[PDB]
Amino acid sequence: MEQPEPDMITIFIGTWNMGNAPPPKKITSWFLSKGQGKTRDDSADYIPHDIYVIGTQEDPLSEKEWLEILKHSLQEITSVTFKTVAIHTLWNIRIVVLAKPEHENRISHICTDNVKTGIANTLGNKGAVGVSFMFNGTSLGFVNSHLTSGSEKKLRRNQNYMNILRFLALGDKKLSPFNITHRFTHLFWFGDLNYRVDLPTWEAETIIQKIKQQQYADLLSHDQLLTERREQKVFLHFEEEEITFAPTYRFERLTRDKYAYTKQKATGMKYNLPSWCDRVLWKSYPLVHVVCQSYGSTSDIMTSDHSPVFATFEAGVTSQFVSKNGPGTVDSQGQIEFLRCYATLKTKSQTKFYLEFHSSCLESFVKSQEGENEEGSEGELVVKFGETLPKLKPIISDPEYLLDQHILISIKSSDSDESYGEGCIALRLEATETQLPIYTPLTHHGELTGHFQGEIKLQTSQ
Numbered sequence: 001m002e003q004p005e006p007d008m009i010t011i012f013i014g015t016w017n018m019g020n021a022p023p024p025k026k027i028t029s030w031f032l033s034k035g036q037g038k039t040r041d042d043s044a045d046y047i048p049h050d051i052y053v054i055g056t057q058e059d060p061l062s063e064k065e066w067l068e069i070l071k072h073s074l075q076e077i078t079s080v081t082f083k084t085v086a087i088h089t090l091w092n093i094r095i096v097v098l099a100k101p102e103h104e105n106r107i108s109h110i111c112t113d114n115v116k117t118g119i120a121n122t123l124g125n126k127g128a129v130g131v132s133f134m135f136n137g138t139s140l141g142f143v144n145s146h147l148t149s150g151s152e153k154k155l156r157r158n159q160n161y162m163n164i165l166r167f168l169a170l171g172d173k174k175l176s177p178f179n180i181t182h183r184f185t186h187l188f189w190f191g192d193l194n195y196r197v198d199l200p201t202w203e204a205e206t207i208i209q210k211i212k213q214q215q216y217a218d219l220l221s222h223d224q225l226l227t228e229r230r231e232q233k234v235f236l237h238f239e240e241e242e243i244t245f246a247p248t249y250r251f252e253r254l255t256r257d258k259y260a261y262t263k264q265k266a267t268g269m270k271y272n273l274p275s276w277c278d279r280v281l282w283k284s285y286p287l288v289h290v291v292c293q294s295y296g297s298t299s300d301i302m303t304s305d306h307s308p309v310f311a312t313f314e315a316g317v318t319s320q321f322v323s324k325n326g327p328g329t330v331d332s333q334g335q336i337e338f339l340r341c342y343a344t345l346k347t348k349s350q351t352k353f354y355l356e357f358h359s360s361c362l363e364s365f366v367k368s369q370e371g372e373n374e375e376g377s378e379g380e381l382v383v384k385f386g387e388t389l390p391k392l393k394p395i396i397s398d399p400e401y402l403l404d405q406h407i408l409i410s411i412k413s414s415d416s417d418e419s420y421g422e423g424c425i426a427l428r429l430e431a432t433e434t435q436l437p438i439y440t441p442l443t444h445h446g447e448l449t450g451h452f453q454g455e456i457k458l459q460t461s462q
């Protein structure tokens with residue numbers, strides 16, 4: 001009588017800087033996506049999300065204490081006893097992953113890790129925790145980061161981001177050229193990112209007035225995370241839902257009627273103008289379904305100087321496919337061919353380069369011959385592969401499997417074997433047996449290093 005495997009799941013993401021205070025007795029509004037912003041319909045209150053991922057900062061509770069509160073809260077809402085997938089804490093930064101009991105046998109390869117940011121003085125409370133796992137055929141990653149505080153420290157926040165994405169060891173370790181920004185079908189990155197509204201301190205009361213009027217436009221135009229992202233300084237190739245809720249920091253505790261922005265000994269004589277510190281971003285592989293269903297803040301949880309933030313997503317997932325052939329052999333009906341491909345690189349290096357193709361649809365990664373270096377008009381390096389690239393042999397040829405897969409590409413130096421650029425190509429093509437354009441930007445350490453473009457021709461069993 002087996003339940004069919006899902007094609008889509010819903011995921012709840014929560015971030016809350018708890019301000020080193022215990023929570024109030026009731027926090028269900030958080031998990032219901034109720035308050036300000038893009039909120040969830042009342043008619044969905046009893047429908048459980050498939051996965052709940054809860055990130056805290058300045059969390060004063062034990063793992064045991066917080067798990068008990070979380071599981072009781074979800075049982076009250078849904079009448080379901082959720083299973084603990086993973087819990088990991090670095091200092092007072094914590095991530096909890098809970099899942100419906102029906103998903104226990106769909107989840108495998110659970111990993112946790114942390115990154116400590118800063119050196120000496122700036123090492124010891126900021127960094128990130130994360131969790132990854134497989135959900136049937138779909139790889140999921142989750143990062144909760146508490147970045148450097150202070151309105152004048154946006155560059156340090158951007159440096160913290162680059163250290164976390166380089167050093168957090170999640171996902172398939174065989175994907176050696178790839179950082180967490182390429183290892184997952186869906187990656188969610190959330191936390192107290194600590195970016196501020198960059199307006200003069202003497203405009204504090206003006207800002208509060210704007211908030212009371214629910215007029216966020218002239219504040220969001222100065223939000224450091226939106227401006228740094230627009231300038232490609234941080235979170236390149238991530239998405240965020242439009243913000244339609246009030247700044248979530250810095251509140252007087254025990255009400256939400258008052259923003260506490262003035263400099264005090266307790267703040268290091270820093271101002272904390274109202275800001276959207278608490279954020280949820282994501283990055284999914286090309287042409288995979290991901291839709292943000294909610295993004296908002298609670299109004300009734302007041303123990304911290306931050307309000308909790310929620311976001312919910314409908315995310316596409318795939319099945320664990322088994323044919324008569326693969327896994328454990330190739331299906332010769334299938335092939336992936338790359339035609340007239342070239343990489344354009346920002347590097348000044350004059351080494352030869354080769355490609356590596358990594359995918360779950362291959363028995364193991366494939367290494368190309370070296371390309372032929374030319375100079376582009378505007379000074380650049382162009383690495384030409386012609387029709388020289390290997391024919392990739394997928395393990396399963398069924399189009400219902402193969403059209404849902406992705407090929408990770410690394411371009412590596414022949415001299416050093418180091419990646420100069422990583423990217424991802426979807427096989428969700430408009431046509432099979434047809435030459436079609438392909439394209440990915442290439443990044444390294446999450447910054448743009450080039451592009452890969454050319455044509456693909458996909459052979460399936462149909």
Ligand SMILES: *CCC(=O)Nc1ccc2cccc(Cl)c2n1
Pocket residue numbers: 109110111112132133134139140169170171172173174
């Ligand atoms: C966390 C260490 C590790 O290697 N995890 C791992 C291994 C294999 C995987 C396959 C597919 C998806 C994921 Cl998330 C995997 N993670």
